Design a protein around this ligand. Structure first.
Ligand SMILES: *[C@@H]1O[C@H](CO)[C@@H](O[C@@H]2O[C@H](CO)[C@@H](O)[C@H](O)[C@H]2NC(C)=O)[C@H](O)[C@H]1NC(C)=O
Ligand SMILES: *[C@@H]1O[C@H](CO)[C@@H](O[C@@H]2O[C@H](CO)[C@@H](O)[C@H](O)[C@H]2NC(C)=O)[C@H](O)[C@H]1NC(C)=O
Ligand SMILES: *[C@@H]1O[C@H](CO)[C@@H](O[C@@H]2O[C@H](CO)[C@@H](O)[C@H](O)[C@H]2NC(C)=O)[C@H](O)[C@H]1NC(C)=O
Ligand SMILES: *[C@@H]1O[C@H](CO)[C@@H](O[C@@H]2O[C@H](CO)[C@@H](O)[C@H](O)[C@H]2NC(C)=O)[C@H](O)[C@H]1NC(C)=O
Ligand SMILES: CC(C)Cn1cnc2c(N)nc3ccccc3c21
Ligand SMILES: CC(C)Cn1cnc2c(N)nc3ccccc3c21
Ligand SMILES: *[C@@H]1O[C@H](CO)[C@@H](O)[C@H](O)[C@H]1NC(C)=O
Ligand SMILES: *[C@@H]1O[C@H](CO)[C@@H](O)[C@H](O)[C@H]1NC(C)=O
Ligand SMILES: *[C@@H]1O[C@H](CO)[C@@H](O)[C@H](O)[C@H]1NC(C)=O
Ligand SMILES: *[C@@H]1O[C@H](CO)[C@@H](O)[C@H](O)[C@H]1NC(C)=O
Ligand SMILES: *[C@@H]1O[C@H](CO)[C@@H](O)[C@H](O)[C@H]1NC(C)=O
Ligand SMILES: *[C@@H]1O[C@H](CO)[C@@H](O)[C@H](O)[C@H]1NC(C)=O
Ligand SMILES: *[C@@H]1O[C@H](CO)[C@@H](O)[C@H](O)[C@H]1NC(C)=O
Ligand SMILES: *[C@@H]1O[C@H](CO)[C@@H](O)[C@H](O)[C@H]1NC(C)=O
Ligand SMILES: *[C@@H]1O[C@H](CO)[C@@H](O)[C@H](O)[C@H]1NC(C)=O
Ligand SMILES: *[C@@H]1O[C@H](CO)[C@@H](O)[C@H](O)[C@H]1NC(C)=O
Lengths: 772, 772
């Protein structure tokens, strides 16, 4: 199919429209730039390899390069692998880039460089030097960068990459970079705002440094600035998950009342973790276009009840006041200033970590007439008491977030506390109004708890303490509910009328309610589904279900059932036929996950007991030691079969004689050592085949006919035991010449032998002696 | 060291005192009896193999045999592996056993035999034929068994091994077995008690059959009988986890009032799952020595409130009345008859599954003066209300079991519901008075909850809903408490005074309290240990701990810390030195488990931060990719190092130069491919070395010096990648001739190559061609 097999260990992609030739050698275990990169290459990515040096020979023929991504070939020791440490910093020889007349972007992050590389072409718009060892910026070193527009210099001096001195920037070092728009000096041990800066700047990142004072006029000329981040200067260090040294005398970052006067275009101001005790209104007197303000992790508890500065922010969209609580103070309630009611445009208000015992509707009245409010986040406040009915006045909201509180009758998990949330590396909301009570202490629910909440579309009760026999009465007011997350509670399914009052329920998650399923004698009614007439998806994963009082689950509507992490092996004990049709009467079911059910064999009758429209079946991670492939004929609509992570040793003699319809067959991580003589013969709408991580030694053409192999969208063969003898001549030739996508050819499709060929890639194999 | 290497694939043990030669071939994948079994063999075990037949040649020379254990060489299909099903039943040719003049015990269970084997020697005392296909007993087939004392014939006709007809026993089939003492016909589809049985019987097992009625004279001559089990005849089928057919019209097994009159020696009566509604006192009129009575899984709920039969049971030790509740009835309280107070000798009372809402002190008053009572089990009763102070009247008890209830302000997991709890296969009580409240709904505790319980030595609160900041006040009355199981709650360690009122506490289990450790911003005081002055063992596994407000844990008493399943990889993030001494001030710590902490590397400072008397350290299951063995020099008292299940690839050049104290080194399941030249040179304190499940190809003599191998109690080498070429001549010869204990030589110490030798045991390898 190809006359010239591709031997380059990089992925090569073509974008005709933009005339781009994309060569991606990410994580190919290279120790040298590979030979034979196409001369027309425009984008070359060499990230995460161990190439030790760059030189004029490196990109000699690649004169059309617009981008070189050469990140992390020598990452600082504390940031990189300790098993394969980089022995010596990257070496860049003179004139390696000067011939790259079209070069627009150069990423050299994470290479332990000591200086800004010189000789850079004047076409360059973007230079990235994060996580190097450059901590002195001099003007001579920047003249080469006359046309630069984006400059990343951060993470060159901080606790994961120390330089042991203060960062140094020469007076006016950046001022003649007349096109510079984005400057990032974060995580750098910087002590003063550099001046004077070019007035073209749109974004200035100065966060996580040692700046104790802003001068008057530090930002005097930046009338185009749109984003300013001064966070983490004078940090709030309590419970910090990184080594944290506060400014002396409990001092805040000191910002003169007029410091932002010039910033008329400012849209985002981030003052997270600056130990602020007051927010002077004067700050915002000539900023009228501000949309995003981050004041989290300061000491603004007393200020939130006053907050006169809010009157100057009628265009604010997002306000974050999280984690401003006074240490060791557990306030009785939340005191929001009336000034909040002047925030016409506010869509998102986050006030986590205010820390108070009781939320009362009257406390939220300053927010009552904010017409655009979409998210109210009061998580992580240790609230013990909240009458949920108070949110009848907030029907317009999209998300009411009370996650992680102590109530009883999506941001990253580390978000407010991590060092740099933007560090670069080498859900039910869509259903409508959402009330998030997850991770609270709700141990008993009753209908009155939800009075005036009929508008709710998604209720998250995950991770409460609900240990109750639901009888269909607990959720009466929730007439519109489409999504209920009940996971990680202690559901007791004594009554099959559980949940039946949620008449519009489409998704139900009762996963990780294993508690009552773990003790003998307790009754479980798994047929509670019959009464839910629009239920589309049911998740009951990790419930340890090993017994059921009812012998059939019933639904006219269910399409998806997740049943992972249960004990169907016990339910289907050989000789007990009573539960072999447990899923048979789920007549619209198309997807069934019964992985992780300890099913070491499938009793005969399982496949005949499947519902008729089953499309996606997972039997993964079952320790399956044998499989009667012929029984798949019962599954007349089957299109995806996931048998991964089992102990299978054979494939069917004729996949065409087992499942005529099957499109995706996943057999990775089994014990298959050979294929049947005619395995894929006539399997014409097979499209995806994963045989990776098995023990296959040889494959012959009869098992792998081309009538099927090139209608394959992907064929996975890596991590097997291929024997590269003269018997493998067809397989080797086909792999070398095929158009079919086979991942990891450059890295993990390898001969195990014989001898000379051990560890050699099949792509590089020369078997001419077989043809002498 | 040996002149004649052992090639027999069986373990051979010598007991000089008992004149026994024990040959154990259990599960050796044998398809024939091996040649060369010692002529002096007295005990030969061939269980779980695939030997298809027995013949006079089988034991031809083994005339001293006293026991043959030939179980499970052809298991019934539903009971056996479905990947290696037995193709044909065991074949026994005539006179295979008649020469075995000393044979006392013959186990032929699970071989699909169709008849009682004939030709057995008259020495035979024990014959076991369970899980065969023998379902008609004729007197002629039993004549060979004149001296038999123990006869196991059950599991020959039941749902896991059907015969599709009723069991048949000829009239008086057993009567001329004049020495018969133990007869078991369980799980056999038996329809009547066989009569007449020999009066020498001491134990009669008739359980799990289809006996609907006992005749008044069925047991008339059994004046020596000590154990009678009639359970599972007319079973109680509600929630049965096995196919269960009840007697018609809800009838119980029906037992005339005088059916037990002859059984004056009876000590054990088992009537579990007989659908009994009454226990007539007349049953026990001539039974005065009964010690154990099982009446579980009947319908005796109302009888328990009357129970006149108990007046005839003054010598009873154990009484089981569990799971007698009326279906769909949730009683208000438990009604124990006053007759219970006549149970003078009772030690154990189990009344699980009575099902009632409220336990009150007065309900237990019939038990108040049972002086010998040790165990009171009221688990699995859905009790909602119980004042724990009532157990001040029960200080003499060893265990008060309220496990699995619904209280709010050790038997196998399947026990009462499994089909045959005696089916054969092919904890804090020791601290003193124990109150087991595990798996209840306790969400809040206060000191008054434990008023008058100061005598308690162990409290099990595992698996409640306790989501509370303990401050040292919640357990004040528990002045004698030595063991607290607080696992699987939601401990909030805000205060370092948590648990300090438990002044005699020696063991604390706060494992699986990960809830509050999983959300950022929450304060956790890990230094709460300082206040527990006799605390010996702390378990805090599976807490997901990744942050700590305190930097050091402190204790003058702690000897064992389990810290498995946390995130020390995050706590010890490279460049953050603040927690590197977390354990340093546990000055008496001898055992530390920090397995499963995602430690892919160990930051420098970890080993210097360890406390000085550490002896047993586990770093297992960490994904460890590298290890600086020299740092072990800091651990001057280290004796056990568990590095199993990691990704290590090398051993130290000289282990002796890394640790002078190390005795036990566990390296199993790593990626080691070779040993260093002088690995064990002069490692004189080494006693135990596990290298199994690595990728080792070759071992040379320099690595394994003889003066070290001679002190090894065990050296594990199985499941490596041994290359059996002429380069391996020393290793192969040494393995064949050494006295060092090496497990699995017969099964899993194998050549992977070259070619011809693939899969061959190295013990069987002949390398003479290397020496021509
Ligand atoms: C190839 O390199 C060019 C040059 O850097 C990339 O072009 C940039 O793409 C981003 C994506 O929106 C734009 O925001 C930048 O403005 C572009 N810069 C220039 C100078 O054009 C291009 O994305 C790269 N393509 C691939 C597939 O890697
Ligand atoms: C940031 O700069 C400070 C100096 O401003 C560095 O601190 C010095 O470190 C040296 C060597 O570690 C000490 O001898 C000095 O006493 C320190 N000076 C002060 C004022 O503390 C610090 O190491 C730098 N931070 C990083 C992460 O490199
Ligand atoms: C070897 O076989 C003999 C005879 O079967 C075993 O001796 C019996 O051991 C049980 C176990 O306690 C005793 O109750 C019996 O009284 C013993 N004698 C008989 C005739 O059964 C002996 O235990 C076996 N040894 C081993 C190591 O398996
Ligand atoms: C126990 O014995 C009964 C008969 O006493 C067996 O039941 C018969 O089974 C055959 C074959 O399935 C049926 O055609 C008969 O109608 C059954 N008779 C009755 C009275 O039910 C039963 O199969 C046996 N049980 C086992 C496990 O072998
Ligand atoms: C059928 C009842 C008489 C006993 N019972 C059996 N299963 C259950 C169960 N899951 N929850 C319960 C909760 C309260 C009371 C009884 C039960 C119960
Ligand atoms: C110290 C408080 C100002 C805030 N706080 C910080 N960590 C915690 C914590 N684990 N549990 C709590 C329980 C109730 C109230 C506050 C907290 C709390
Ligand atoms: C709320 O806090 C503000 C700010 O100090 C204060 O002026 C006001 O009195 C407080 N109101 C209440 C009800 O606590
Ligand atoms: C909660 O507030 C609602 C008002 O919407 C009221 O009807 C209800 O009684 C309140 N519940 C409690 C427990 O105060
Ligand atoms: C509910 O909350 C839990 C825990 O906070 C979260 O993991 C889960 O994804 C949420 N459920 C939905 C449906 O968004
Ligand atoms: C579920 O099945 C059981 C049969 O075991 C029956 O008692 C119960 O009424 C059924 N419930 C529904 C809703 O069908
Ligand atoms: C307990 O039940 C028995 C059985 O009928 C009855 O005779 C007795 O009066 C009951 N006692 C109490 C206190 O309920
Ligand atoms: C529990 O019983 C004790 C008597 O031993 C009594 O002092 C206490 O008040 C009772 N507690 C409750 C809540 O009834
Ligand atoms: C406490 O009870 C739990 C749950 O039944 C059990 O797993 C655990 O072993 C018990 N703890 C002790 C110390 O006996
Ligand atoms: C500890 O908590 C209990 C109940 O929350 C309270 O009665 C007691 O005063 C507290 N003790 C201290 C020292 O705070
Ligand atoms: C635990 O550590 C915290 C801060 O690290 C300290 O305030 C507290 O007093 C300590 N408690 C004990 C018992 O050492
Ligand atoms: C390790 O070996 C070297 C060379 O024999 C020796 O100098 C050194 O002291 C040894 N270290 C230990 C801890 O035994």
């Amino acid at each position: 199919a190809r006359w010239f097999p591709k031997t380059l260990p990089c992925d090569v992609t073509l974008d005709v429209s933009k005339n781009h030739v994309i060569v991606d050698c990410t994580d190919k275990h290279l120790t040298e730039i590979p030979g034979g990169i196409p001369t027309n290459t425009t984008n070359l990515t060499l990230t995460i390899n161990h190439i030790p040096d760059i030189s004029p020979a490196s990109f000699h023929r690649l004169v059309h390069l617009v981008e070189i991504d050469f990140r992390c070939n020598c990452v600082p020791i504390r940031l990189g692998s300790k098993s394969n440490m980089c022995p010596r910093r990257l070496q860049i020889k003179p004139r390696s880039f000067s011939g790259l007349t079209y070069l627009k972007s150069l990423y050299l992050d994470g290479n332990q460089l000591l200086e800004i590389p010189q000789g850079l072409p004047p076409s360059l718009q973007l230079l990235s030097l994060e996580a190097n060892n450059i901590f002195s910026i001099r003007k001579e070193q920047l003249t080469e960068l006359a046309n630069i527009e984006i400059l990343y210099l951060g993470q060159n001096c901080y606790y994961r990459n120390p330089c042991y001195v203060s960062y140094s920037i020469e007076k006016d070092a950046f001022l003649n970079l007349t096109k510079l728009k984005v400057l990032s000096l974060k995580d750098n041990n910087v002590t003063t705002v550099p001046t004077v800066l070019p007035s073209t700047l749109t974004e200035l990142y100065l966060y996580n440094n040692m700046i104790a004072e802003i001068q008057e006029d530090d930002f005097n000329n930046l009338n185009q600035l749109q984003i300013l981040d001064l966070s983490g200067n004078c940090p709030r260090c309590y419970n910090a998950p990184f080594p944290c040294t506060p400014c002396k005398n409990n001092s805040p970052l000191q910002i003169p009342v007029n410091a932002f006067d010039a910033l008329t275009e400012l849209k985002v101001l981030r003052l997270h973790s600056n130990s602020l005790q007051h927010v002077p209104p004067r700050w915002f007197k000539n900023i009228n276009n501000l949309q995003e303000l981050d004041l989290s992790q300061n000491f603004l508890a007393k200020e939130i009840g006053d907050a006169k500065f809010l009157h100057f922010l009628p265009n604010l969209i997002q306000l974050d006041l999280s984690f401003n609580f006074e240490l060791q103070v557990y306030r009785a309630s939340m005191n929001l200033s009336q000034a909040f009611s002047s925030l016409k445009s506010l869509k998102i208000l986050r006030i986590r970590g205010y820390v108070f015992k009781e939320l009362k509707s009257f406390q939220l009245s300053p927010l009552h007439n904010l017409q655009n409010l979409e998210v109210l986040d009061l998580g992580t406040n240790f609230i013990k008491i909240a009458n949920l009915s108070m949110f009848k006045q907030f029907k317009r909201l999209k998300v009411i977030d009370l996650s992680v509180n102590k109530i009883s009758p999506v941001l990253e998990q580390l978000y407010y506390f991590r060092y740099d949330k933007y560090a670069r590396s080498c859900s039910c909301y869509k259903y409508g109004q959402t009330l998030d009570l997850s991770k609270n202490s709700i141990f008993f629910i009753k209908s009155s708890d939800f009075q005036h909440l009929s508008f709710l579309k998604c209720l998250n009760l995950s991770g409460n303490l609900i240990s109750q026999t639901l009888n269909g009465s607990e959720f009466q007011p929730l007439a519109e509910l489409r999504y209920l997350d009940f996971s990680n509670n202690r559901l007791d399914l004594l009554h099959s009328t559980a949940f039946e009052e949620l008449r519009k329920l489409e998704v139900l998650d009762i996963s990780s309610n294993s508690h009552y399923f773990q003790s003998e004698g307790i009754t479980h009614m798994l047929n509670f589904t019959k009464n839910l007439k629009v239920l589309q998806k049911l998740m009951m994963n990790d419930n340890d279900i090993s017994s059921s009082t009812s012998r059939t689950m019933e639904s006219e509507s269910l399409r998806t059932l997740e049943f992972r992490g249960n004990h169907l092996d016990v339910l289907w004990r050989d000789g007990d036929n009573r539960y072999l049709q447990l899923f048979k009467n789920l007549l619209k079911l198309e997807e069934l996950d019964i992985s992780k059910n300890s099913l070491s064999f499938l009793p005969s009758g399982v496949f005949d007991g499947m519902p008729p429209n089953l499309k996606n079946l997972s039997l993964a991670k079952n320790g399956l030691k044998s499989f009667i492939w012929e029984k798949l004929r019962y599954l007349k609509n089957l299109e995806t079969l996931d048998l991964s992570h089992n102990q299978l040793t054979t494939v069917p003699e004729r996949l065409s004689n087992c499942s005529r319809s099957l499109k995706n067959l996943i057999l990775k991580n089994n014990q298959i050592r050979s294929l049947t003589k005619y395995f894929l013969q006539d399997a014409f709408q097979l499209r995806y085949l994963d045989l990776s991580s098995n023990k296959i030694q040889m494959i012959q053409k009869t098992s792998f006919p081309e009538n099927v192999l090139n209608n394959l969208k992907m064929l996975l063969l890596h991590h097997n035991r291929f024997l590269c003898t003269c018997d493998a001549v067809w397989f080797v030739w086909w792999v070398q010449h095929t158009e079919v996508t086979i991942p990891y050819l450059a890295t993990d499709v390898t001969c195990v032998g014989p001898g000379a060929h051990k560890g050699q890639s099949v792509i590089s194999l020369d078997l001419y002696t077989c043809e002498l």
